[PDB]
Amino acid sequence: IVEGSDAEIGMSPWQVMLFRKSPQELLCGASLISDRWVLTAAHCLLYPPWDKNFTENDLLVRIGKHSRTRYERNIEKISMLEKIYIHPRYNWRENLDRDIALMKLKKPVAFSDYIHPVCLPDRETAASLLQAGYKGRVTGWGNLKETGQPSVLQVVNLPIVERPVCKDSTRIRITDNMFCAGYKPDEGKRGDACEGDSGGPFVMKSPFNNRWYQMGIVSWGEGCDRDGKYGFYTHVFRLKKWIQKVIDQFGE
């Protein structure tokens, strides 16, 4: 996160750290959706152009963390993965279209003041909140600058940007499975996700039932917090049916 703040303890209970076993390193962010399922970006696991292709035994998920590097002795829980599911039509060859993946834990995690699932949006929550100008919140342990690392979880609140503006800021072909967010060069407020934040959640707080809803997954961008550039996120609601399908068809 660039130009964000330190998160408060218990502020983002569904925040998950994707951790590589050896070298032991932070891979990406992710989110807890139930006691056995984690949602993240497909490119955190499979990105052939960079020879990236992790399997269940390559990683660990770390839940209820605040500190980036410390082993949070009786706060965090570490789980092993049972299975990884990448969207069948994930487009790593061109634009990261459908950048989403489900990971099923070997054993259910127990909830606590620091571990709690986020909600998945319904068509109606999506329809009233995914509006240009409305702000969401992004969290992660990623880079503080394009080109260092935070010691604690960082948070930033960013406005959703109109699709045409998103389209006109890049040469990459943008699809219905993506939305962009950030401040415009003129708003004179700034902030963004950056390397290390991928797979973390873009959330919004429903003014209706006061629950937190995950609307996006940190996906991609060009540089970080660049003027006239915007962060792009996987559109969770548009891929919800694939989400329901795998859970129903495979677990819980």
Partner: peptide, 8 residues
């Protein structure tokens, strides 16, 4: 990066 318990 502080080490994680070996059980993991």
């Amino acid at each position: 990066f502080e080490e994680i318990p070996e059980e993991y």
